[model samples]
Target: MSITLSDSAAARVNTFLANRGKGFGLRLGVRTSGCSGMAYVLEFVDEPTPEDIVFEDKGVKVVVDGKSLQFLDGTQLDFVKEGLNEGFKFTNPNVKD
Candidate 1:
């Protein structure tokens, strides 16, 4: 499985990278804390380390560390606008109830 981004999500990410003036792409990972036991973490990455798995989608790059891939594989990042609210959402098949 691989990480992907929707068109809107890609555009938003690109805008952020351009504003920051320097970044390789978005870093996607998982952390333990949520009531469900896992939570998603997203951040900017200036560069990818040797242990990171990089995926290109919709012209945007998504960097995932090897250890986090197991929990984030097949995840799709999407940007959504509901009324005046706009933000990123994740569609992750690896997450289970």
Candidate 2:
């Protein structure tokens, strides 16, 4: 049970980090929102506190909290490009697996 990033996802993240100019990596968290039981959130991390769990893949970092780890585990971050619509997407493992 772990989180990872795809090549395109990592590339996009790095592009964003390079533009931000100062940050350790991206932060991964969950909120009790109206959809999917839990809504995923993202933000740039300047410094990682002691409470965060960090995962690195494809030269990019993904910082998550212990609480969100359960839901996000086995999830992969990816970037999809369809026509002019391109953005990040999450590929969660099929529960039936």
Candidate 3:
């Protein structure tokens, strides 16, 4: 019941936080949107609310709410570089149709 980040992903997140100068960490969650019925929300947040669940991975912190945590447990985040395209990817085992 935890969300983890790859080494590359954690490094990337650390870079972003460093460049931003000030931030609590990256906030990860799910929202009811997109044609697929749910969309992932990732953003740099100044701080987490009292109800937010926080997990530390590598050198980065991931913030998730109680509701979103239910759906994101066992998820692993990764950063990939494919040619000129580089971005974050999620390995979520609990997703179902």
> Candidate 1, residues 3-97: lDDT per residue as tens digits?
88889999999999999999998999888895767778889998899999888987778889988898788888899999999999999776655
**Candidate 3 regions with alpha-carbon error over 4 angstroms:** 94-97
- Candidates sorted by lDDT, descending order? 1, 3, 2
- 57-83 per-residue lDDT for model 3 (tens digits): 886878988778887888899999999
Cα shift from native, residue 23, model 1 (Å):
0.9
Against the correct fold, how does model 3 do in TM-score? Answer: 0.86
Candidate 2, 1-97: lDDT as tens digits: 3688888989999999998887899888888877546677888998887888887888777888867787888888898998999998887867543
- Among all windows of 10 consecutive residues in model 3, the one with the lowest summed lDDT is 88-97
Q: Candidate 3, residue 21: CA error in Å?
A: 0.8
Question: What TM-score do all the candidates reach, one by one?
Answer: 0.86, 0.86, 0.86
Cα RMSD (Å) per model? Answer: 2.0, 2.4, 2.1
Maximum-lDDT candidate: 1
Clashes of each: 0, 0, 0
